[PDB]
Amino acid sequence: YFQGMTEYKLVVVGAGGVGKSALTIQLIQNHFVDEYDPTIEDSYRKQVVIDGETCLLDILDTAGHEEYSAMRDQYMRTGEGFLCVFAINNTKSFEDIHHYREQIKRVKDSEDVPMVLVGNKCDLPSRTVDTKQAQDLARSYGIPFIETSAKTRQGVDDAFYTLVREIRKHKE
Amino acid sequence: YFQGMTEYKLVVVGAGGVGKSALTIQLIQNHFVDEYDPTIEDSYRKQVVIDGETCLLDILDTAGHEEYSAMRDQYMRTGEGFLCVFAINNTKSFEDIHHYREQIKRVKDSEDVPMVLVGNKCDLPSRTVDTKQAQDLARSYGIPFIETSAKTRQGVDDAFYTLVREIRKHKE
Amino acid sequence: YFQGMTEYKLVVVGAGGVGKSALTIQLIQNHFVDEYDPTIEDSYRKQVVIDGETCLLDILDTAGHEEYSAMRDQYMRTGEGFLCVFAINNTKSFEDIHHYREQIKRVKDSEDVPMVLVGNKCDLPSRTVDTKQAQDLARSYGIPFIETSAKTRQGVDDAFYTLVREIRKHKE
Amino acid sequence: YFQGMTEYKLVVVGAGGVGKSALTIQLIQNHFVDEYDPTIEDSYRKQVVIDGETCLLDILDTAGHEEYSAMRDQYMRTGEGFLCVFAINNTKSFEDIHHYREQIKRVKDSEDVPMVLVGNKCDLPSRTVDTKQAQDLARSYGIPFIETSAKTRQGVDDAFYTLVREIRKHKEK
Amino acid sequence: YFQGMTEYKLVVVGAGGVGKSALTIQLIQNHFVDEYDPTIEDSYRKQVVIDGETCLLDILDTAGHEEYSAMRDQYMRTGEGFLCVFAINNTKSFEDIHHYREQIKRVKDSEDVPMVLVGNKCDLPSRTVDTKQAQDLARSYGIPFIETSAKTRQGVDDAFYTLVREIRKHKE
Amino acid sequence: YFQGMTEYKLVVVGAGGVGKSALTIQLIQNHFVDEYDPTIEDSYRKQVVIDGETCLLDILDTAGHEEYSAMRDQYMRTGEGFLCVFAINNTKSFEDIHHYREQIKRVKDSEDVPMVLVGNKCDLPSRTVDTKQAQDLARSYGIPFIETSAKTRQGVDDAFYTLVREIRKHKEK
Ligand SMILES: Nc1nc2c(ncn2[C@@H]2O[C@H](COP(=O)(O)OP(=O)(O)NP(=O)(O)O)[C@@H](O)[C@H]2O)c(=O)[nH]1
Ligand SMILES: Nc1nc2c(ncn2[C@@H]2O[C@H](COP(=O)(O)OP(=O)(O)NP(=O)(O)O)[C@@H](O)[C@H]2O)c(=O)[nH]1
Ligand SMILES: Nc1nc2c(ncn2[C@@H]2O[C@H](COP(=O)(O)OP(=O)(O)NP(=O)(O)O)[C@@H](O)[C@H]2O)c(=O)[nH]1
Ligand SMILES: Nc1nc2c(ncn2[C@@H]2O[C@H](COP(=O)(O)OP(=O)(O)NP(=O)(O)O)[C@@H](O)[C@H]2O)c(=O)[nH]1
Ligand SMILES: Nc1nc2c(ncn2[C@@H]2O[C@H](COP(=O)(O)OP(=O)(O)NP(=O)(O)O)[C@@H](O)[C@H]2O)c(=O)[nH]1
Ligand SMILES: Nc1nc2c(ncn2[C@@H]2O[C@H](COP(=O)(O)OP(=O)(O)NP(=O)(O)O)[C@@H](O)[C@H]2O)c(=O)[nH]1
Ligand SMILES: O=C(NC[C@@H]1COc2ccccc2O1)c1ccco1
Ligand SMILES: O=C(NC[C@@H]1COc2ccccc2O1)c1ccco1
Ligand SMILES: O=C(NC[C@@H]1COc2ccccc2O1)c1ccco1
Ligand SMILES: O=C(NC[C@@H]1COc2ccccc2O1)c1ccco1
Ligand SMILES: O=C(NC[C@@H]1COc2ccccc2O1)c1ccco1
Ligand SMILES: [Mg+2]
Ligand SMILES: [Mg+2]
Ligand SMILES: [Mg+2]
Ligand SMILES: [Mg+2]
Ligand SMILES: [Mg+2]
Ligand SMILES: [Mg+2]
């Protein structure tokens, strides 16, 4: 019997200051946060319809730099899909993506974990990471790539919905 | 790729005056039709969410007594699920059910066609068909039975949603 | 910041066979379950709007007779509000109500636990519990009383929504 | 040109105790009010979809017996459609309907005011007004008749939605 | 009597590669398609609310590279309104709008067909068609102009909704 | 007892041509108005959900330059919250903001009126008001600042929703 909507546990990861919180708050509250208030751990929920199916998104917004490592392992084990976020004006955040992806694969003991690569801050003019380099990286992982802006909303719904679609593909 | 909601083609059949139209209009318009205006053929649409899936119901309301028999065969071939309606104060309408069911199975060349047995007018005091007799008939067919009232709305959404659930079970 | 809708943890309690599951399934699925399948423990969820506020209902459907008593204490501690259900044609289930209420107050160590008294099966003709006696019982507890039918849907939404309203009053 | 949904100003009238408030509260809150708390004047709002059109219902719940008569005239002038409610177990409330209808036509200075006749408390066994008599009365006025119960919800949405449909028919003539 | 929502048959036309499919998929899926997969003929549906009226959009996505087909004329004649799409960085696509407008008038056998002029890819730096030139063209036809980006979503809902508004104006 | 959704009376003010109407029509109709049709006074409504609470926005779109002054005073008294709009390519419109805020405070006889500063036309290239100057101004007033574009929709929902959030904060003090 149907016991209520499907829930998806989504985790947003990436380096400090890339816009993990701003992405999530834009999704939930339709609000752009201009301030930089570093996150420890915050959880949000939103019911949405994707490809005709109602679902409840449970979104965990993580800290760029996780001090205690057992807490990080716990959210990686609980997460069903991951947004791996870098900022298109921060080359170091892009170089860090490989580390986040390896950490997730290690903790979940899986090679095929639903993930989407997200290049955020696409509204800003001083781009240091080229679209082609990110697309190549995503292709090498077999995952989608989406450019976003938490300020203009470009790609925000698409990033989260794409991740749900990746989870659903993996569940069949 | 998703191109739009799933559509379900539902056909409402049964003897003259059992409340086929009244059931459908209660579903679509939240309106009870007190008048008895015999139907020739009418089609209705409604988008609903059932078990978290969005769907488009295409509902064909049929005549109690079909003049052209080729037109009847055509809607039987086209329909994916059937509500077989009798009135709980009309014994003849209940005895007629087996004819509608045989016609449908013949045309579809199948013993497992999605169907729901509907005992309508359950608000009226003059009952001549017992719940147990209808339940036994439905059990013999392997289909659900639901008592309805187009006037009180008892069972109306449930009849249609149950039929969609029967179609989905058959498709998988 | 708002992190998504408010969640309410609702627990449905009462004697065996009074319609705990049937009420919950009518709420969630718009479906009347005619079969009597005794419950061990089932959980359901639904998003609804009550008094203009969006909320997520988490509903725990319990067994009439709880064997292991630590498991019962655990759901009573976790529940924020309780529907105490009897059947209007079952005097014993009505006389039992005070036991359920005492068990809840004992475990929660409180005299002011959000609760609603529910008299189910109000569609049936064989009534043995008078509405006035139920209202008097509810008045003695300081809680609302609602007559319901899981078959007709009378009062079903009202029972759950009223319970949410009781929870909100207690939280403020 | 479109400035937001269409608004319909609905007024609920009828004798004391027929269930005007209970109908409205069932519509708005999905709650049956068992208590009898006499109304002075209350206003409620709900956004609904009727025949594919989104609309905002502004509903004025009136007192059975109106003290100040200028205030009654004011809501009758402002109202676009009226639910005229009686209780099916209260013959006197049914006999009163013609007075409410006449008062509305007088104030609005019109013979063609959108209205629906509502026979409430249809869940109760003690019926004293026959459906044939109510149907005849409604036919004589050229308006719909609907039996309702604020307790079971029978006919509640239908009464209000039917009234909106009557208003729309009148606006298109 | 109301039998369910109004349906509008929309057709999206324009030169190869202008973003007809990308616009439609952004509408339906909230997804930007980066790949260029040439279309032959694809159909989508979506229920939306426009000016307070619920409607069902039936959307036909066409080929931009297609020699003369009787089969093309046949599907175009089902259209009630047309999005005529060019890319703001492709002057030839803008000059081709005259050909699509003549094709539509020919197939519909009418001078007054609901249409909207859509200038897509407004996010790109390589603009060759100025806003004022497109506005002047649209004014000459007596139709609206909307600038869009299937990547940012600028103007996507507005293009389709505007077309529905044009259809409604024509029907009254 | 709940009688239907809460209504918020929002007023959009600012110099002529800054995009007051364009913002409102983007919110209501999802439509970008490219034409410049100067407003006299128009009212719009929209039901929205903000922070899980359903509400009805009643939005008054005002004229840049209000000729008869009693009509302006009346909407300022009635309004619960104000969007103060300038265009990021029009320095004069930004210099006007302080005066619109003072006019609102004078009419309402209060120092603490819910308001949001809106910098519109952020899609256009010829910016003359820098983000930092607007943020500083907003900070000096203790109000939020949001950059918007009625063309791209950037910030449109956020401006209106933020204003409702400011009204709710003020009602809870
Ligand atoms: N222009 C622009 N600024 C952005 C965007 N996303 C985030 N920002 C800004 O970048 C800063 C950091 O954003 P924030 O959400 O807090 O980043 P975070 O990744 O959650 N940081 P942490 O790891 O400390 O929790 C903030 O000043 C924010 O406004 C964007 O897409 N565009
Ligand atoms: N009391 C009550 N009356 C009902 C109910 N359903 C239908 N009726 C009434 O029964 C009569 C016949 O209803 P109708 O829907 O037209 O029947 P039908 O099966 O569509 N007739 P046909 O086959 O000629 O199209 C109408 O007067 C209607 O008001 C019900 O559930 N309860
Ligand atoms: N007529 C009618 N029958 C009802 C209603 N509610 C429940 N029933 C019936 O009463 C029986 C028991 O219902 P059920 O929901 O299983 O009760 P329960 O309280 O969950 N049983 P348990 O404690 O064993 O889990 C079933 O046959 C069901 O159809 C009602 O409102 N009216
Ligand atoms: N059984 C049943 N009782 C009803 C129904 N509608 C109203 N009642 C009851 O009848 C009483 C009067 O209802 P109420 O809504 O206050 O009537 P009213 O017409 O608003 N009275 P007034 O004009 O004084 O404001 C209440 O006790 C209420 O529970 C109904 O449909 N069925
Ligand atoms: N940057 C940008 N690229 C776009 C935009 N719309 C479409 N594209 C890109 O342009 C290419 C062609 O788009 P597509 O939608 O397939 O074009 P079409 O008009 O459907 N082509 P056909 O007629 O062959 O079906 C794709 O690579 C797509 O990503 C847009 O608004 N901006
Ligand atoms: N590019 C761009 N143009 C805009 C934007 N907002 C408004 N405009 C344009 O600026 C002009 C004025 O907008 P309008 O909404 O009428 O301004 P207003 O503040 O309501 N004027 P008034 O005070 O006379 O009523 C219009 O041509 C409109 O298209 C925007 O965000 N971006
Ligand atoms: O709810 C929280 N975290 C608990 C878990 C961890 O992993 C999760 C992974 C994905 C989504 C939700 C998760 O929820 C939380 C922290 C701070 C506030 O809420
Ligand atoms: O719609 C109609 N017929 C076409 C077909 C028939 O079978 C169907 C079966 C189920 C649902 C729709 C159907 O539509 C129709 C004739 C008269 C009024 O509507
Ligand atoms: O859901 C479950 N338990 C977790 C908790 C306990 O207390 C609850 C109290 C109220 C509502 C839900 C509850 O859910 C559960 C076990 C087995 C099936 O569902
Ligand atoms: O709301 C009130 N009156 C003002 C007007 C009158 O006519 C109306 C007609 C229909 C809907 C609302 C109306 O509102 C009111 C007084 C007391 C409580 O509410
Ligand atoms: O609606 C109007 N005025 C009445 C009032 C005034 O202040 C208001 C402030 C905010 C929202 C609605 C208001 O509406 C109106 C005149 C012209 C067009 O609409
Ligand atoms: Mg953060
Ligand atoms: Mg019929
Ligand atoms: Mg049970
Ligand atoms: Mg009252
Ligand atoms: Mg294509
Ligand atoms: Mg204006």
Numbering used by the authors:
A (entry chain D), B (entry chain C), C (entry chain F), E (entry chain A): -3 to 168
D (entry chain E), F (entry chain B): -3 to 169
From the paper:
Although, various RAS inhibitors have been described in literature,24–32,47,48, in this paper we describe an approach for the development of RAS-effector inhibitors by combining different elements i.e. (i) the hit identification via a method of intracellular antibody fragment competition; (ii) structure-based design via crystal structures (KRASQ61HGPPNHP) and NMR (waterLOGSY and CPMG); (iii) identification of clear structure-activity relationship (SAR) for the development of potent compounds against KRAS and (iv) the proof of concept in mechanistic and phenotypic cell assays.
Abd-2 has a benzodioxane bicyclic core with furanyl amide as the right-hand side of the molecule. The electron density is stronger around the benzodioxane core, with the furanyl amide substituent less well defined. No H-bond interactions were observed between the compound and protein, with only van der Waals contacts with K5, L6, V7, E37, D38, S39, D54, I55, L56, G70, Y71 and T74. Superimposing the complexes shows that the CDR2 region of the VH is oriented towards the binding pocket, where benzodioxane interacts with the side chain of K56 in CDR2, partly overlapping with the furanyl substituent.
